């Protein structure tokens, strides 16, 4: 089991970027795949993408294909999701979740952090 801790909430102006961090503890970071999921207010979940700290194989959802970069660094046992060109459409809670394998669903979800994009 791994537990995930996320950065606090942020408010951004349209056109700017946000970098959402996630840190792992309580297990080995390098053994879990990190998958980022978007929770829209009033709506369901949307997958944004995943990274394997060791294998790479970054895989992003098509909607954010030219906008989101997902990284990981086993040095600090963290993962990041950097989303460029923010829109009001992007207000959501962004969750960091771990999975026991690259092709397995994640059972180890983090806290979730709200990013608000507004004027």
């Amino acid at each position: 089991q791994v537990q995930l801790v996320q950065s606090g909430a942020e408010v951004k102006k349209p056109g700017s970027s946000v970098k959402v961090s996630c840190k792992a503890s309580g297990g080995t970071f390098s053994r879990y795949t990190i998958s980022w999921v978007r929770q829209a207010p009033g709506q369901g979940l949307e997958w944004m993408g995943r990274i394997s700290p060791i294998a790479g194989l970054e895989n992003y959802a098509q909607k954010f294909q030219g906008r989101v970069t997902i990284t990981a660094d086993i040095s600090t046992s963290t993962a990041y999701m950097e989303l460029s060109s923010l829109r009001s459409d992007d207000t959501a809670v962004y969750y960091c979740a771990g999975s026991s394998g690259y092709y397995q669903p994640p059972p180890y979800w983090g806290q979730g952090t709200l990013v608000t994009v507004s004027s």
């Binding site: 709506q43 369901g44 979940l45 949307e46 997958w47 895989n59 098509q62 669903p105």
Partner: peptide, 18 residues
Amino acid sequence: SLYYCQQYGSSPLTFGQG
């Protein structure tokens, strides 16, 4: 509460509506 499906074995790991 809410229920969802996730296609974790598919290329995009798409989620249901809830």
